[PDB]
């Protein structure tokens, strides 16, 4: 059915006509995946085409290339993009694959059978068939586990991954000893999301990252096998709504949560998101300004550890509420920052005043200048700087684009979750099309007062 | 074996509890979402009232300059507020038990963090509760979506913006004047007026009020004579009646002659859907705007965009509004900044 | 201060448990069409 009369849905809600049509639904999914891979390839080739050799990635509006560079392709020590060819390779691969997935999509959408339950029995399904659904879920879970293990393999054996914390500046490194200790990994899991903690966003070394992916790989594989070879318990069968729209709503809630988490990763983390590629964080840039003028004024003959600001607090150096020696001014809020250009100057009780007085390196000053001058602030039309800044610098940090876009997405996806969950309940119970004029519940209820 | 498992569990104690919780016979509905909502909103409310009346000044900007926000400390209704927590704390969780004393807690702005978190929780639970009662009464379930718009706004100004800026001290103050302060600073640092999503929000509220007044005036205009002279025409309607109380055709006709025939709605369901949709979408977008500006993707910057042949800047209105923005920027938190760029 | 933490933790765990296990008690069956 492809009409209002035959389905009950209008041309807008047109896509709901595919709920019980396994074939065309599969076609829609495959075609959509085709669109995703299409965009990946095309945009990657776009970024490779527009890239300029002697400029940082974050100055050129790149979001895909920083991922590949993070994985360790075409990168020299320090975050210099030398070889831009593997990017071209991945882009091409994705594009062509997009041709394949596109063909399959159009086929199953228009050419093939509408119902896969007739001609087939393995690819056919009833939404109300719990076992089949848990089977598919298990399969795809195993796939995800395999992907996690792909990252693990890539980082352990094939070249390695770009480590910004590498002893000698940022450089690609093969992770020899990943973290398998449950105390640590799951210490990430059960930790507060607030300041100084950061939950899972507070991961600052590739050992813990890759080890975490080992754990998540094992977990996904074992869970996949678990769901393939078992059936849902009684309590789950009683607690859940078993229909397509309900499953859609669940995945929507999940993806909303994930969207928010990703936005936070892009905004605060600088390990999985190297500042060499993605640019500095807000925290990093503010701290970079404080550092910069600390250095400038110290060079002008000021004892910064004794310099009293207008408020009475340290102008350049003060204490955090828990005692640590931190940079002064507003950036006191950002004292949880950890950056490879600053940690050399870090001691047990925070910033080491002696190292600040004596051992500050030129490259550190360059880092601070660069980062404070490339802070993630900019307009919608990519005018770099604060809102009052004039038109000269064409710049908006990749972190801003990623975080904002994924907040947008996560948000609307949550809205969709509410919508489809509600409609799932109403359709399951049987009143999603209105109140029964002959069975109005309220009329069968005792009045409130 | 279909979708819902239609079954019961035989007058158990836990089942009795679940029944009372989910009872539709209670004067105020107390669903599971209410099991979350009631304690949260109660704690939040108590702390809010007590603090708004008697709380000592709070070092909001962490610069050891406490701001007075309570009534018993020289404030009135308009200027009184619950001052946001200290910038020295930032996004750190600061519960009472993490302070050495209640006095310290009050000094650093603990009340704000407590109230904000509890309120957001309880209001999310309020949304869930709207869904829940809708389900219990056999209704369509999309009132909580409509209400999801305001929840999004509150979440934007009380949680997301502090997250993007790195401190709850940037969260909107719980007070009138504090709110105005929040707005002004926000304009200075994000140029929110020149942000298309805020424009969308203004379209949502202006348009919302417009359509409210319009629908209201139309239906009030076409009320069917069921009442005597000088008597309230509201008495001409009775709760629960099935007969319509106004001439829908007359209203549609009036609207049709006011603009043109095809500009008017015929389907009341469509009309009310539109009435629900316009402001909710507007507010959705503005909420998103506040959060995305919380990650410094600011409004459109047209400062010195027009140049003459010689290369001199020809100002526009955007430059003037930029002058005002500059005023707010240079003047706000006069003692908080030590360095030329405001990056936090 | 620690006792306060214990108290609040008790309350939170209590209401959270009631919420979770409450919504697990066949909530879709709680409708007027049952």
């Amino acid at each position: 059915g492809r009409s209002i009369e035959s389905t009950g849905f209008a041309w807008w809600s047109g896509n709901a006509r595919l709920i019980n049509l396994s074939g065309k639904l599969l076609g829609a999914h495959v075609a959509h995946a085709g669109l995703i891979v299409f965009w990946t390839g095309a945009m990657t080739l776009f970024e490779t085409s527009h890239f300029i050799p002697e400029k940082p990635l974050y100055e050129q509006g790149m979001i895909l290339l920083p991922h590949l560079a993070t994985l360790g392709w075409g990168v020299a020590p320090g975050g210099e993009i030398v070889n831009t060819y593997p990017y071209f390779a991945t882009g091409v691969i994705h594009l062509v694959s997009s041709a394949v997935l596109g063909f399959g999509g159009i086929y199953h959408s228009i050419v093939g059978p509408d119902v896969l339950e007739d001609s087939f029995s393995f690819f056919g399904y009833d939404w109300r068939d719990k076992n089949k659904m848990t089977t598919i879920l298990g399969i795809h879970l195993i796939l995800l586990g395999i992907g996690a293990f792909l990252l693990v393999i890539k980082a352990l054996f094939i070249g390695g991954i770009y480590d910004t914390w590498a002893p000698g500046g940022g450089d690609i490194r093969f992770i020899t000893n990943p973290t398998l200790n449950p105390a640590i990994i799951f210490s990430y899991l059960l930790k507060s999301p607030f300041g100084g903690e950061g939950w899972i966003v507070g991961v600052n070394n590739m050992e813990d990252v890759i080890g975490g992916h080992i754990w998540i790989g094992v977990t996904c594989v074992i869970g996949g096998i678990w769901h393939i070879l078992t059936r849902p318990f009684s309590w789950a069968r009683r607690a859940f709504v078993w229909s397509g729209e309900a499953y859609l709503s669940y995945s929507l809630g999940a993806l909303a949560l994930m969207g928010q988490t990703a936005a936070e990763y892009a905004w605060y983390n600088n390990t999985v998101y190297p500042s060499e590629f993605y640019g500095p964080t807000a925290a990093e840039a503010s701290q970079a300004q404080a550092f910069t003028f600390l250095v400038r004024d110290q060079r002008l003959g000021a004892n910064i550890a004794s310099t009293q600001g207008p408020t009475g607090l340290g102008k350049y150096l003060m204490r955090s509420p828990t005692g640590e020696v931190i940079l002064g001014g507003e950036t006191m809020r950002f004292w949880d920052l950890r950056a490879p250009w600053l940690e050399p100057l870090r001691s047990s009780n925070g910033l080491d005043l002696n190292k600040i007085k004596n051992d500050i390196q030129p490259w550190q000053e360059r880092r601070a200048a660069e980062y404070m001058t490339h802070a993630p602030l900019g307009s919608l039309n990519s005018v770099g700087g604060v809102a009052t800044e004039i038109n000269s610098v064409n710049y908006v940090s990749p972190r801003s684009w990623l975080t904002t876009s994924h907040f947008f997405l996560g948000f609307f996806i949550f809205i969709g979750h509410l919508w489809h969950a509600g409609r799932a309940r109403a359709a399951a119970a049987g009143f999603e099309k209105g109140i029964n004029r002959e069975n109005e519940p309220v009329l069968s209820m005792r009045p409130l007062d | 074996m279909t979708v819902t498992l239609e079954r019961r569990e035989s007058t158990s104690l836990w089942e009795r509890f679940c029944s009372w919780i989910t009872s539709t016979e209670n004067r105020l509905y107390i669903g599971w979402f209410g099991v979350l909502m009631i304690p949260c909103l109660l704690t939040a409310t108590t702390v809010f009232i007590i603090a708004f009346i008697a709380a000592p000044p709070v070092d909001i900007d962490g610069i050891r300059e406490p701001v007075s926000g309570s009534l018993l400390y020289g404030n009135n209704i308009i200027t009184g507020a619950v001052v946001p927590t200290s910038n020295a704390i930032g996004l750190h969780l600061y519960p009472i038990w993490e302070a050495a004393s209640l006095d310290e807690w009050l000094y650093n702005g603990g009340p704000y963090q407590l109230v904000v978190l509890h309120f957001l929780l309880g209001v999310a639970a309020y949304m869930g509760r709207e869904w829940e009662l809708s389900y219990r009464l056999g209704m369509r379930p999309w009132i909580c979506v409509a209400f999801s718009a305001p929840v999004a706004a509150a979440t934007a100004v009380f949680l997301i913006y502090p997250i993007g800026q790195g401190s709850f001290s940037d969260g909107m103050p719980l007070g009138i004047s504090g709110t105005f302060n929040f707005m002004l600073v926000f304009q200075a640092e994000h140029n929110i007026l020149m942000h298309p999503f805020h424009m969308a929000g203004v379209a949502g509220v202006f348009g919302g009020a417009l359509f409210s007044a319009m629908h209201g005036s139309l239906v009030t205009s076409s009320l069917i004579r069921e009442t005597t002279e000088n008597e309230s025409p509201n008495y001409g309607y009775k709760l629960g009646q099935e007969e319509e109380t106004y001439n829908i055709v007359a209203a549609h006709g009036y609207f049709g002659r006011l603009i043109f025939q095809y500009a008017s709605f015929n389907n009341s369901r469509a009309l009310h859907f539109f009435l629900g949709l316009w402001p909710v979408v507007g507010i959705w977008l503005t909420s998103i705007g506040i959060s995305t500006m919380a990650f410094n993707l600011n409004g459109l910057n047209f400062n010195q965009s027009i140049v003459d042949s010689q290369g001199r800047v020809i100002n526009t209105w955007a430059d003037i509004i930029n002058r005002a923005n500059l005023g707010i920027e240079v003047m706000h938190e006069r003692n908080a900044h030590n360095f030329p760029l405001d990056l936090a | 201060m620690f006792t306060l933490k214990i108290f609040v933790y008790s309350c939170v765990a209590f209401f959270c448990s009631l919420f979770i296990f409450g919504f697990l008690s066949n909530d879709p069956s709680r409708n007027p069409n049952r």
Partner: peptide, 25 residues
Amino acid sequence: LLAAALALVAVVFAVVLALFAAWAA
């Protein structure tokens, strides 16, 4: 931090969990 917190949390949780387990039975 202290064992008392885990003790109380797991205690209340186990109590309500058992209540639910009886209901499920």
